[PDB]
From a paper:
Ferritin from the marine pennate diatom Pseudo-nitzschia multiseries (PmFTN) plays a key role in sustaining growth in iron-limited ocean environments. Typically formed from 24 subunits arranged as a symmetric, hollow sphere, ferritins take up soluble Fe2+ and catalyze its oxidation, with the resulting Fe3+ being stored as an oxy-hydroxide mineral in its central cavity. The di-iron catalytic ferroxidase center of PmFTN (sites A and B) has a nearby third iron site (site C) in an arrangement typically observed in prokaryotic ferritins. Here we demonstrate that Glu-44, a site C ligand, and Glu-130, a residue that bridges iron bound at sites B and C, limit the rate of post-oxidation reorganization of iron coordination and the rate at which Fe3+ exits the ferroxidase center for storage within the mineral core.
Two structures were obtained from E44H PmFTN crystals soaked for 45 min (E44H Fe (45 min)) and 3 h (E44H Fe (3 h)) in aerobic Fe2+ solution. All three sites are occupied by iron ions with modest differences in metal occupancy regardless of the crystal soaking time. These structures revealed that the coordination spheres of the iron ions in sites A, B, and C are markedly altered in the E44H variant relative to the wild type PmFTN structure, exhibiting what might be described as ligand scrambling. The side chain conformation of His-51 is altered such that this residue now coordinates to the iron at site C (Fe-C) rather than Fe-A, which is thus coordinated only by Glu-15, Glu-48, a water molecule, and the bridging water or oxo/hydroxo group. His-44 and Glu-130 are ligands of Fe-B. Fe-C is coordinated by His-51 and Glu-130 and forms weaker interactions with Gln-126 and Glu-47. A water molecule is observed bridging Fe-C and Fe-B. As a result of these differences, Fe-C is displaced toward site A by ∼3.5 Å as compared with wild type PmFTN and the E44Q variant. Structural data showed that, in both cases, iron at one of the sites (Fe-B in E130A PmFTN and Fe-A in E44H PmFTN) has fewer ligands than in the wild type structure, suggesting that inequivalent Fe2+ affinity at Fe-A and Fe-B accounts for the loss of positive cooperativity. E44Q PmFTN has a rate constant ∼6-fold higher than that of wild type, whereas the rate constant for E44H PmFTN is about 3-fold lower than that of wild type PmFTN. Mineralization in E44Q PmFTN was similar to wild type protein (initial rates of 7.0 ± 0.9 and 4.1 ± 0.8 μm Fe2+ min−1, respectively), whereas mineralization in E44H PmFTN was significantly slower (1.7 ± 0.5 μm Fe2+ min−1).
Residue numbers in the entry:
A (entry chain E), C (entry chain A): 1 to 158
B (entry chain F), D (entry chain F), E (entry chain F): 1 to 159
Amino acid sequence: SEELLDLFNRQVTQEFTASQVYLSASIWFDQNDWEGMAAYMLAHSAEEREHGLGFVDFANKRNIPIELQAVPAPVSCAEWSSPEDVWQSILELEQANTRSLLNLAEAASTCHDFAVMAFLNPFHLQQVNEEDKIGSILAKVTDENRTPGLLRSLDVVS
Amino acid sequence: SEELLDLFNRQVTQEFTASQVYLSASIWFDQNDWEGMAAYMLAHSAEEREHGLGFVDFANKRNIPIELQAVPAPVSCAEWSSPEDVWQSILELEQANTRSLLNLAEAASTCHDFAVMAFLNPFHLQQVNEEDKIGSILAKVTDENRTPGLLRSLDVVSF
Amino acid sequence: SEELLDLFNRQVTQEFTASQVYLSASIWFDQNDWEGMAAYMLAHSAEEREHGLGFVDFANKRNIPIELQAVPAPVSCAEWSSPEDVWQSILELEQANTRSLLNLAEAASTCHDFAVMAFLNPFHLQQVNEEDKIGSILAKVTDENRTPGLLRSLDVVS
Amino acid sequence: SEELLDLFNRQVTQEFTASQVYLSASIWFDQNDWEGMAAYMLAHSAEEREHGLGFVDFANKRNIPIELQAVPAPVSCAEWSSPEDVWQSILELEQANTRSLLNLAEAASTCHDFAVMAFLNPFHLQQVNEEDKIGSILAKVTDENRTPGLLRSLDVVSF
Amino acid sequence: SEELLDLFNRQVTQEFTASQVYLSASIWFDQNDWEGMAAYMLAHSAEEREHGLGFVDFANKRNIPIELQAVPAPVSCAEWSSPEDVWQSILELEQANTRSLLNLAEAASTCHDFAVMAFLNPFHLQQVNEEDKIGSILAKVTDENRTPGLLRSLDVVSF
Ligand SMILES: [Fe+3]
Ligand SMILES: [Fe+3]
Ligand SMILES: [Fe+3]
Ligand SMILES: [Fe+3]
Ligand SMILES: [Fe+3]
Ligand SMILES: [Fe+3]
Ligand SMILES: [Fe+3]
Ligand SMILES: [Fe+3]
Ligand SMILES: [Fe+3]
Ligand SMILES: [Fe+3]
Ligand SMILES: [Fe+3]
Ligand SMILES: [Fe+3]
Ligand SMILES: [Fe+3]
Ligand SMILES: [Fe+3]
Ligand SMILES: [Fe+3]
Ligand SMILES: [Fe+3]
Ligand SMILES: [Fe+3]
Ligand SMILES: [Fe+3]
């Protein structure tokens, strides 16, 4: 299906869009002196770009033509006013990256595209790990931010 | 699907049930002075526990509520009176572990739960290997036990 | 001596019962993003199972017939709503593990079973250490949790 | 001599035929839980393939056209019902590999093809060693199988 | 308690008696070409001597007078005519070593001799292990000896 091919392309776009969103979070954090959260965001910005590159390389091998799309300007930073806002946006982004992976897998399953399904398996599993991790950070952030200054004291951790 | 959550929970209970059945087998072997077969069973009891803990960890990560169930008393050690009986029970146990993983996978499949299916793949292949290994032990035991004392003579050598 | 045998059997069951309660605690902690406390509980679950295995091994050597019982489902996790609740249950578990060791010892002492008494000596000493360690963590948990978020900030540490 | 070219080509087919017969034997052994004898056969299947590839390489170098023939289905695994049957077939197989090398050498000899004869010398001596080894295995199997379970007891120890 | 001193002295004699019984067993095994079982017995003869020397040393330290008694001739080697007979005697010997340690401990206990009881604890646990090991050997011997030559075949492999 040209549609399975669309969805695979769209996954590339989604990983690069996520890369930029993470970068935007790193900027917000740095500008507000949360250098720890900033470094985490930057490293994860690079990792999303790596995912997208992984998809590109597979596509090239499997003759799925890739048409690189615009990477949209991230928009959530206009509204962010605390670390909790940023982490909630990042969770939402990953929950989205996951849904788009599952849509892609459904299409591949419908088309009997065994190679594409196999390729995706480690990404399905990585997404479970990432959502769990982000969810856990967000819950720590939310809880520590109930006492003034205390969240800051644990950016100084990680 | 509540059914999927359910089957996932039950797989934990299955792995822990298996862990206890292996422990039971180790005891029987030790009590009847088959230390080599007893060691094998004990190690495999640990491994089944690790499997169950694997499932627990993934569940936690994927927000599948785990409720720990009673781990039944192993009762196959009532009817055991030779090593063949024990290995036969262990074979049936793994055959059941396999079937329950396949049922789990089919529920995942119906639900399009690609992450659960991916998680299960190495277990599917492990079970193939375990059933084969167990099968092959049981064959060997059954053949060797046709001569008095000969099986004993290879608890020593192997294991 | 049937009483000593029975108590020896129940001790195995008590260890495995405890293992499951520790597993249940690690689950509650993980679900609630206390990964540190979760890890402590998981390690201790393994340890409890090791203690049970220890009793099994001695029993086999000493011809104490072991019949493996059911390991009852843990039921405290339904009532836990904070780390404090979890640690308080685990303390109570260890106090019970201790009482049942002392009963088993007393039975052995009545029977003049010097080998069983000697076998049990390191376990008595280990219970003292565990009760102390758990009581101490509970104290620290109870104190830290008087300030919102502060406990979180110290799961992340130790 | 077209006859020499021919016999040279056929030796490749012989080595590959042997490779498959060994593979067949491994399968039979594995299926009947003789993992040690199955490993031996598998390794020897690889080795026969290497022999055939040796012949191919020399042919290429010496401008003897190689045309690859069908590699027949191994069918001796129809009649196998004990390890003795399998080892007996393998012995006959090597006896045939030997005879075919000797026929090859005799054709070379008639043609004064000193390079082919030199090439063959290590294979002649290898076959002597293989027939002896196989022979000795088969004797051992046949003796051990006179007591129930005893052969099994030495798939474990040896191999 | 003179009774405690006494029982302590007798335990030395017991350990040395055991040492000689093991030596006797080694001789029987060697004479009948069971070199592996003979080695095991010889090593265990040394170990019993070490036990007796342990008791002597503690006694000296705790001012319990030691008077060395005659070490009886081992006479169980009159009735031995198979390895089973020998291992059976060794099992009974350890059962007696255990009982005598327990009697010693009970005397200590009555006398509130906490240092003697503490000294004995590792021996109590060692005896548990030795009786289990011996028991398990004897089972294996008895099973293997049901087929002619088979026991011999595992003096070689084990030990
Ligand atoms: Fe399209
Ligand atoms: Fe398109
Ligand atoms: Fe397009
Ligand atoms: Fe991604
Ligand atoms: Fe990501
Ligand atoms: Fe990632
Ligand atoms: Fe399992
Ligand atoms: Fe298993
Ligand atoms: Fe497994
Ligand atoms: Fe415990
Ligand atoms: Fe504990
Ligand atoms: Fe402990
Ligand atoms: Fe060949
Ligand atoms: Fe060959
Ligand atoms: Fe060869
Ligand atoms: Fe001794
Ligand atoms: Fe001893
Ligand atoms: Fe000793």
